[PDB]
């Protein structure tokens, strides 16, 4: 299926992510307050993916609308990016099993891992800045990209777009921190060490939270949740650890 993430306003961005969560995941009964829950990704057949259309990068104009992300559904990994103006899917080497019809598929030599992307980007995520400006610049870098080997500018662009799509889908904390950048005052989101820690421990968190049954706290390595409110403010979507 296809979903839009609309960066026009804070409200459109949050609503976009929540629509995706509601369609691809199921709330945990023991970590759910009102309409907010930690949800578990629904099991789909291996190879399943969904498309994300990027919209609203320019608030007042309908432009910058040719970027699509391909996301593996069972784990929210970004398999690559599509230029819909050239009809070209740039696919990371580690996603050979993701087959997208109708597009030209460019099998890149570059793998998707954060270690690889940060090396090619010459950019560390801890301290990485993301503003509306840098998402526009990231968009333009991806639309200008060609060939089968990632460049420094395309890698920086992927690091930023993965943070505000797939990682924000996983972590309400990143969603809430980044969305400030979409307001009219246009502040800068700076990724924190804690943000990075969350993204590198998603599997560990996903293995623990399904066991929660109303205990006073949860401890996963250096991560501590001391009440339900803390969990809900941090984690939105977890893997399905059957």
């Amino acid at each position: 299926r296809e979903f839009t993430i609309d960066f026009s306003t804070q409200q459109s961005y949050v609503s976009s992510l929540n629509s995706i969560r509601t369609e691809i995941s199921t709330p945990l009964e023991h970590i759910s307050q009102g309409t907010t829950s930690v949800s578990v990704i629904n099991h789909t057949p291996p190879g399943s993916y969904f498309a994300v259309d990027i919209r609203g990068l320019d608030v007042y104009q309908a432009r910058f609308d040719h970027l699509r992300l391909i996301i593996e559904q069972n784990n929210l990994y970004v398999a690559g990016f599509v230029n819909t103006a050239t009809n070209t899917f740039y696919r990371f080497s580690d996603f050979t099993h993701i087959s997208v019809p109708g597009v030209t598929t460019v099998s890149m030599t570059t793998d998707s891992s954060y270690t690889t992307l940060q090396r090619v980007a010459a950019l560390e995520r801890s301290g990485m800045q993301i503003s509306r400006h840098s998402l526009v610049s990231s968009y333009l870098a991806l639309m200008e990209f060609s060939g089968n080997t990632m460049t420094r500018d395309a890698s920086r662009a992927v690091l930023r777009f993965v943070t505000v799509t797939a990682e924000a889908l996983r972590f309400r904390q990143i969603q809430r921190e980044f969305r400030q950048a979409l307001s009219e005052t246009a502040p800068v989101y700076t990724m924190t060490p804690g943000d990075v820690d969350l993204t590198l421990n998603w599997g560990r968190i996903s293995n623990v939270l399904p066991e929660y049954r109303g205990e006073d706290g949860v401890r996963v390595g250096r991560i501590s949740f001391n009440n339900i409110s803390a969990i809900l403010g941090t984690v939105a979507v977890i893997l399905n650890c059957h």
């Binding site: 409200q11 949050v14 929540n18 009102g34 309409t35 809900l232 403010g233």
Partner: peptide, 6 residues
């Protein structure tokens, strides 16, 4: 209207 956590 972001509720308590969004």
């Amino acid at each position: 209207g972001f509720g308590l956590f969004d």
